[PDB]
């Protein structure tokens, strides 16, 4: 019964109770907010190719 003096918590259980969640990378915030502020740039700049300012306040020719 040598096995009953070893720690009963396996190395698997340590590795799954210590690294429980896959941690958030810091570049995920950058790439997500950049891919959404590209849409903020596209709609709302006055130099984008697809501005909303002519679909919203049309013109007066």
């Amino acid at each position: 019964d040598r096995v009953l003096s070893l720690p009963a918590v396996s190395k698997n259980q340590v590795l799954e109770n210590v690294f429980h969640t896959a941690p958030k990378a810091p570049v995920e915030h950058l790439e997500k907010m950049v891919s959404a502020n590209s849409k903020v740039y596209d709609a709302l700049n006055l130099q984008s190719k697809r501005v909303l300012i002519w679909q919203v306040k049309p013109a007066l020719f």
Binding site: H20, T21, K24, S35, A36, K39, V40, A43, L52
Partner: protein
Amino acid sequence: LSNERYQLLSQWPDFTTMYGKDFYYRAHPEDLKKFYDAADEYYKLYETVTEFDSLSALASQVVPNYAARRRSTVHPAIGSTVADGAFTNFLLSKQ
């Protein structure tokens, strides 16, 4: 209106100040999974409030019902108050 929603997505507290491993290992596992779900939810809300190419098709669902309400058999500018005043003038005059 999307501007008034985006103004209250501009007041969201910065959760990427708590992405370090100091806050990972001091924290309860369920509260950390909830914190990561809250960050994922902010990314969903911010990806969908800045989809401004969808407003031009959202506006086409207000247009047909409004245009059918203006396409009236009486008048384009008729409403309930003018019709009520004309009902008093029609009713309280003789027959």
